[PDB]
Amino acid sequence: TVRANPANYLGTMRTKVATAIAMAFDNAALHGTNAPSAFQGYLDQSNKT
Amino acid sequence: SIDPEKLRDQLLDAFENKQNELKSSKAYYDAERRPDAIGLAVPLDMRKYLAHVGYPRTYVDAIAERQELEGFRIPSANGEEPESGGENDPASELWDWWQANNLDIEATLGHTDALIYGTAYITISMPDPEVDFDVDPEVPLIRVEPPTALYAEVDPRTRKVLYAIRAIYGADGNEIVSATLYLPDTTMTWLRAEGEWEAPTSTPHGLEMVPVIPISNRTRLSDLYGTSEISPELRSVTDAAAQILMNMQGTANLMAIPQRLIFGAKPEELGINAETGQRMFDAYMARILAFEGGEGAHAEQFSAAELRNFVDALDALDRKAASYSGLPPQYLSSSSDNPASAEAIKAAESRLVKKVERKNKIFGGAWEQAMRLAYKMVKGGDIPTEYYRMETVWRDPSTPTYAAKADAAAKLFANGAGLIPRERGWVDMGYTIVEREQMRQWLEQDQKQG
Amino acid sequence: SIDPEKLRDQLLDAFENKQNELKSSKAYYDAERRPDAIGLAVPLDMRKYLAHVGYPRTYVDAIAERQELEGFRIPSANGEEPESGGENDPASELWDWWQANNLDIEATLGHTDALIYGTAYITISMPDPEVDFDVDPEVPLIRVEPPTALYAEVDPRTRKVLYAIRAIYGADGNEIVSATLYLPDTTMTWLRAEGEWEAPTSTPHGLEMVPVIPISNRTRLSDLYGTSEISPELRSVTDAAAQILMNMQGTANLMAIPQRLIFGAKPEELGINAETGQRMFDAYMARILAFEGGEGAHAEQFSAAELRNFVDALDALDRKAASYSGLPPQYLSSSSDNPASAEAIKAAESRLVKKVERKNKIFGGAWEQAMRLAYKMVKGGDIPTEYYRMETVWRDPSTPTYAAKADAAAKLFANGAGLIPRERGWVDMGYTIVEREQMRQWLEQDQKQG
Amino acid sequence: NPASAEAIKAAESRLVKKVERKNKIFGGAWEQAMRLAYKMVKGGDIPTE
Amino acid sequence: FVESTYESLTTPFREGRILGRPTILSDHVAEGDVVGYAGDFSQIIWGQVG
């Protein structure tokens, strides 16, 4: 698979993972969805609507 | 054909992978924490008080201090010499671009990093008049780049570059913000970070070869992609000296003075405070401590550790770091004396200055290509076949000793009756090409009166 | 005769087999992990902190650093050939090829591989106009290849090469991405991988001999195929020093300080915590430790090891390495006296300078024969029989004591009244053949005035 | 002490080559800044030399 | 938030201001019944190592 690199699958995965890593930081920071214990608060935690 | 997009990612991989190897070499010149440097006898909470060691910093500086070009020298095309031909000649053309680019400054940095990491890269590119306006637009821009920012794949069947990538990080070093791909007939740039690319600014070029030249430090034909000058030999004594220095530093905090014991005398009889386990003492001079004693009570002490014992190892290890690196012994403070005669310097220096001369020889091979590339870009067509035989001319790497050169040169020239013609006496006094070209004007202005 | 596609595999087996032999010597010029270098006294966890020892690289550089070819000598029935620029003396045509190829760079690498492994190979060909972008197309492509990339079978009856193969590994060092096979009358190459991925290109050539010449490091005739310069004595003293340097480093991590002890007070009497076997002593200066010592206690310490006791053994190993290599003592010991005068420098360098001149004598015969073979390949006719008498000329290996040479050359020439003719004074000063022609022109342009 | 004009040069060697190195690099700032000073006060454009 | 014959895109959706405060837009801010945030965005800091 790595010799052939069909459909540029290897190069495509690198971009697709980098997007997922970025989107996970936003879901963590905004709505707290999977936030690691190290993150102090998340935006959705606010006491006002 | 090859796809530029696939190739951009393919080279970003090989580059951003290769950074992990060369990080090890940088740690010696920046004196970063290496685990192996840390002296084992130091107590675990005290291990943070590191000792750093400067042999690699000293060695790469001592070489890169001594390299500069006096100029370029090119064969006579026809007739006797180009030499008195001045600003019309091909040697002064190539020196004009060197001055205009300030390569006299930044080639010294390129030489330095070629000795740190084992390679650096010269990029040739005609300037775009729409950016970087502090340039002469008639002159080809020449830029030297570290292997932390440019990467190039040599074909091993030839020794040419196949393709290369220059990529530059944001100010915090966390992200690539722009990348440039060089190909044998074109150059391309993408202008924003990797999650946010935009269509490339693209240019052809006529050179039919990649406009990047690898400056590479090498010792053998076998060193096919270059080699860091900071050898494993020199790394090992850099880390060994750090282990000694930390163990001696810890010893100076913990054992350089005796530890004092009293046996047999009861804590209650000493009047020691039962909650805190200790008692105050005024301990000014000539106080005598009188104890009730009994039970065979007496005082005795553990001796100090001699810090001389560690110093004997450091004196021996400096004598190793000198002999491995080839620095003069005074550079590592270890000589029995200073020099005391004009050639007694040349003796101590001789082990280093022959090394510096071979670095000049091996990097000469890069610049003598860089100027062929820059010529072919500016003029187009075939390069005048004299240029394949140029040599770079370099400063004599030893310390200048003008007063001892003087009485020799004058004894050879003998007011024109002597063994050598005037201009070889100027070469021998070590005046640079660029200087002799003005000094020949001053000679005419003097010979006008006699 | 053998079908060439059969012969390449037979050669590639012999070439692959050779690598495992020459890899032994490699492990001393690079300070690789050698198991015999590891000092035995350090415990099995500290064995990772390898010492490395620089003598072999110091020696093999200190020879190759001194070598440089300055030109060629060819005699004739005219008694002298006029210096006459770049071609009319045939020696200047050879020197023209010696710069159109950068052999001034590739030789000073190639001799280092020729000393390390014991051999290197000079390859001659006409340039390929489809591939060789960066050469004058009319000069012969003369180039050096290390024994890690070229192998040649030499017939013991004649010392001629029978055939030779040059095989290039890919960027990962694994697959042979091309092979070039040289026969007596023909050069052949397979271009993409092992002749699996392409059919061979071919070219006939006008020779009786394979167009490859071995540079070989021969100490005596009995080195029928040449041998490594890193001699068994230097390997011995290098590994011996590596063991003693590790045992000293391990001592400084464990035992450069006393180990303190008390007897006659059970752990409960010290208030030692039962789970951890310790109590936090109040470590500051000038405390006095009070104990009951209820058995009739006493204090003792094991001694530190004297690190001087390793150091004055390392002295003897450096002094051995000096005597075996013949390097000036000042290359290896900082405690050896720095020579005060030019005569004392001729004394100290003498042991090395003679050995460098042997390498000049022995490698000269390789380059000399390569030029004769290049002459047949470029010009197609038989060689003028004067070329069999040709000889190389090399840089004076000794340090340039210019102020001593100038007063001597001035005394001998004595403004034309003296002993020597002008030209002998120029060679006694050590000016190259290449500079001598500049001397000619600059003298005429001075005698034009007087 | 270094007793001679030669032993002076031997002792000073490292410091001297380190200062020549700084002078090359700091020269690169003033060689630049004087072009801006000229191009500001004299106006127009930089004379090529 | 739009004018005249209503040809143009509505001002905050051109990333224009509302009442002197700038607008930020994105396609993945909404989750559940929450579709945006207003506040003092100087009260966020973030960092990335290496």
Task: Answer whether C34's CB lies under 8 Å from C27's CB.
Answer: yes
Handedness of CA B306, B310, B311, B316 (dihedral sign): positive
User: Are A23 and E28 an interchain contact pair (Cβ–Cβ within 8 Å)?
Assistant: yes
Between CA C40 and CA C60 the distance in angstroms is 28
> What's phi and psi for B260, nearest 5 deg?
-105, 125
User: Are B195 and A22 an interchain contact pair (Cβ–Cβ within 8 Å)?
Assistant: yes
Task: Answer whether C205's CB lies under 8 Å from C187's CB.
Answer: yes
Between CA B244 and CA B170 the distance in angstroms is 40
Residue-by-residue DSSP string for C124-150: EE---TTT-TTS-TTS-EEEEE-TTTE
SS3 E1: coil
| Distance (Å) of CA B23 to CA A43, B137, B144, B149, B236 | 38, 37, 20, 13, 17
Tokens 């004894």 correspond to B411
For residue C217, give every residue at least 6 positions away whose Cβ sits within 8 Å of its Cβ, in sequence order, or none.
C114, C115, C118, C119, C223, C226, C227, C228, C229, C359, C362
CA angle C170, C171, C173 (to 5 degrees): 65
**CB burial readout C305-333, b (16+ within 10 A) else e:** bebeebbeebeebbbbbbebbbbbbbbbb
Residue B44 DSSP class:
G
Closest CA to B121 of B98, B101, B144: B144
Between CA B239 and CA B31 the distance in angstroms is 10
Q: Where are the alpha helices (DSSP H) in C274-341?
A: 308-325
SS3 content of chain B, % helix, strand, coil (to 5): 45, 15, 40
Residue C202 DSSP class:
E
Q: Where are the alpha helices (DSSP H) in C65-165?
A: 90-100, 103-116
- Experimentally, the structure was elucidated by cryo-EM
Identity of residue C237: V
Between CA C327 and CA C321 the distance in angstroms is 8
Size of interface B-D (CB pairs under 8 A): 54
Chain B residues in contact with E49 by the CB 8 A cut-off are 174
Q: What are the tokens at C216?
A: 């070989």
Three-class SS of A3-49: CCCHHHHHHHHHHHHHHHHHHHHHHHHHHCCCCCCCCCCCHHHCCCC
Burial class (CB in 10 A: 0-12, 13-18, 19+), B126: middle
Closest-CA distance, B131 to chain C, in angstroms, reads 31
Chain B residues in contact with D19 by the CB 8 A cut-off are none
Measured N-to-C along each axis, helices B103-117 and B4-29 cross at an angle, to the nearest 10 degrees, of: 80
SS3 C429: coil
Between CA C111 and CA C215 the distance in angstroms is 8
The reply to whether D6 touches chain B by the CB within 8 Å rule is: yes
Strand order in the sheet with B176-183: B150-154, B161-169, B176-183, B186-190, B201-204
Between CA B369 and CA B215 the distance in angstroms is 10
CA angle B261, B265, B270 (to 5 degrees): 95
Q: Which of C51, C245, C297 sits opposite B263 (nearest CB)?
A: C297
Task: Answer whether E11's CB lies under 8 Å from E3's CB.
Answer: no
Closest-CA distance, B174 to chain E, in angstroms, reads 5
Taking each continuous run of H as one helix and of E as one strand, the counts in chain E are 0, 0
Closest-CA distance, E30 to chain A, in angstroms, reads 9
User: Are B339 and D3 an interchain contact pair (Cβ–Cβ within 8 Å)?
Assistant: no
Q: Which of A14, A19, A22 sits opposite B9 (nearest CB)?
A: A14
Between CA C237 and CA C231 the distance in angstroms is 10
Which residues of chain B from 240 to 269 reach within 8 Å of chain C, CB to CB?
Answer: 240, 243-244, 247, 251, 254-255, 257, 259-267
Which residues of chain B from 74 to 113 reach within 8 Å of chain C, CB to CB?
Answer: 75-76, 80-81, 83
Task: Answer whether B10's CB lies under 8 Å from B213's CB.
Answer: no
The reply to whether D45 touches chain B by the CB within 8 Å rule is: no
Between CA C184 and CA B42 the distance in angstroms is 68
| Distance (Å) of CA A1 to CA A4, A6, A7, C214, D34 | 5, 7, 10, 44, 59
